[PDB]
């Protein structure tokens, strides 16, 4: 519906408005929250993601992580280094880009979206995620939230190099204080800047909590999302596959 | 030096004349091999990789799989489905691709070589594999005998879905044959067509001879190739930390 209004043919013409870095100084990451300004023009659903076409010609997705509701859109983007120092394609191009400078988008992309029905229905959640995999995660908080009648219960794995590089940390502090009994989440830290180290320590704290885990998938009957790592998704699959199924139909990936 | 000739501004026209499958009937994947005819104009050492572009503009690299005193050069391409059923942009491409039709090329691309003095010195290899990270390795083989006064010794670890995925058979069993005093090669079956599964199978199988692994690693001063996957990196850079360091210089390390 919103899919691919914006192509590479035509692009959305935006403007930057902010770029902060969303990390402490003890990370080892290099990451930028960019706000994009798209006057309204840009459509997307909460989990989409959004194409930026690098010195508008090869497109890269980003997960959005603003709410409908907001102004402007927001995206996380980590700087890679080095290319397989050196610098990424996009990444070098984002990592020159300044404030008001035009940045041109393809989209709305994707399916890695709530459930029609979420705040009517009171669906609970488990959101798995490393490194920017948060960022779909932000925006269903917003959404489900109305940032307000949504009554259900959202559990949280999030695996990152450290404390210093929690992408959003602010936001997701904000909703655990604010809704404490709708929200818990479990930080996971793995001290390996390699991606496949770090879905080994996830899987592991899942490990642990495989009593909780389970319950809430089976039990609470549980709508499961993992992001956004590529290691990541075999990892926790085989929690659920040693120990569970057309459903099969609750758990959604986009990893890369 | 070879190092981007050929660029995206000014790409190599190449015609292909040959488009065979590489794996057998009960293989789950789809490859091929393209043999590409470039008028001895592509220049390349054993272990680059060449930039294909679609539709020739976003290109892909291959790693060469032919040798530098053949006429045409090769390349194995996996067919990937589905985009993150459907194709990836490369994919569709190579897979309505015809016999005599026109490619572009860019290159050569890359540093995943053999050490210069090889043939003279005698090195010795370790050569880690999984699905078409078999390539740059039947380039090196065909390089080393001069397809024979090489008469050092290879080992390698190669791991697939199951016997039909094996990439090169007719190559590998050519060279096992021919040289049985200098070629051990260890194949990993899974049975899993995720990747990051491959990967634990091929370190538990150098677990399993950690042994004869360690001991040519330390004791015959190998040179150690890792290719081409992503999650199988870090499994085996596990089983040599875990165990031993500036060498860490024969360490070589192709992965995507
Ligand atoms: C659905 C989706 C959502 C995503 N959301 C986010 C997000 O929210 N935040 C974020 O930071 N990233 C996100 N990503 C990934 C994002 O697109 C990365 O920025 C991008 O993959 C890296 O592009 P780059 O230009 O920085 O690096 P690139 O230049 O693309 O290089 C990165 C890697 O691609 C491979 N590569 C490089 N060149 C080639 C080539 N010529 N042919 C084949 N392979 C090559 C190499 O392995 C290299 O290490 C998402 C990806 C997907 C699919
Ligand atoms: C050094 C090197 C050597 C290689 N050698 C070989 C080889 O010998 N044989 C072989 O088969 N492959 C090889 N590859 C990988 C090869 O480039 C793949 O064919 C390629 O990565 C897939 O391209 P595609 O167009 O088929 O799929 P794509 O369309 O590129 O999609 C593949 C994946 O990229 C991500 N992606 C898709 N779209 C986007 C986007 N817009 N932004 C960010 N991410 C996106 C998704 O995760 C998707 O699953 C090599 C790669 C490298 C880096």
């Known amino acids: 519906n919103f899919i691919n209004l914006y192509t590479v043919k035509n692009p959305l013409k935006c403007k930057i408005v902010d770029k902060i870095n969303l990390v402490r100084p003890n990370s080892p990451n290099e990451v930028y929250h960019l706000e994009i300004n798209h006057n309204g023009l840009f459509k997307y659903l909460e989990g989409h993601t959004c194409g930026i076409i690098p010195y508008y010609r090869c497109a890269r997705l980003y997960s959005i992580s603003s709410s409908n ?27 020159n880009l300044k404030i008001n400078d035009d940045i041109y988008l393809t989209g709305a992309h994707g399916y890695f979206n709530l459930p029609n029905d979420a705040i009517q229905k009171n669906t609970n959640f488990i959101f798995i995620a490393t490194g920017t995999g948060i960022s779909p995660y932000i925006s269903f908080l917003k959404k489900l939230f109305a940032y307000s009648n949504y009554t259900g219960y ?26 404490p009994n709708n929200i818990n989440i479990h930080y996971v830290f793995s001290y390996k800047q390699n991606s496949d180290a770090t879905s080994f320590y996830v899987q592991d704290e899942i490990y642990k909590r495989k009593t909780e885990f389970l319950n809430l998938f089976n039990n609470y009957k549980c709508e499961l ?10 990892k926790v699959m085989d929690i659920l596959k040693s120990h569970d199924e057309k459903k099969k139909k609750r758990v959604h990936v986009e990893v890369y």
Not at 157 to 174: A, C, F, P, T
Request: aromatic share 20%; proline share 0%.
């Open 69 to 95: 509701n907001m102004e402007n859109l927001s995206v996380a983007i980590k700087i890679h280094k080095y290319e397989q120092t050196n610098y990424g394609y996009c990444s070098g191009f984002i990592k």
């Open 154 to 179: 959202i559990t949280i794995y999030y695996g990152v190099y450290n404390e210093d590089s929690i992408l959003y940390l602010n936001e997701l502090e904000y909703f655990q204080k604010m809704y």
């Open 225 to 234: 999302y993992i992001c956004g790592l590529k290691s990541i998704r075999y």
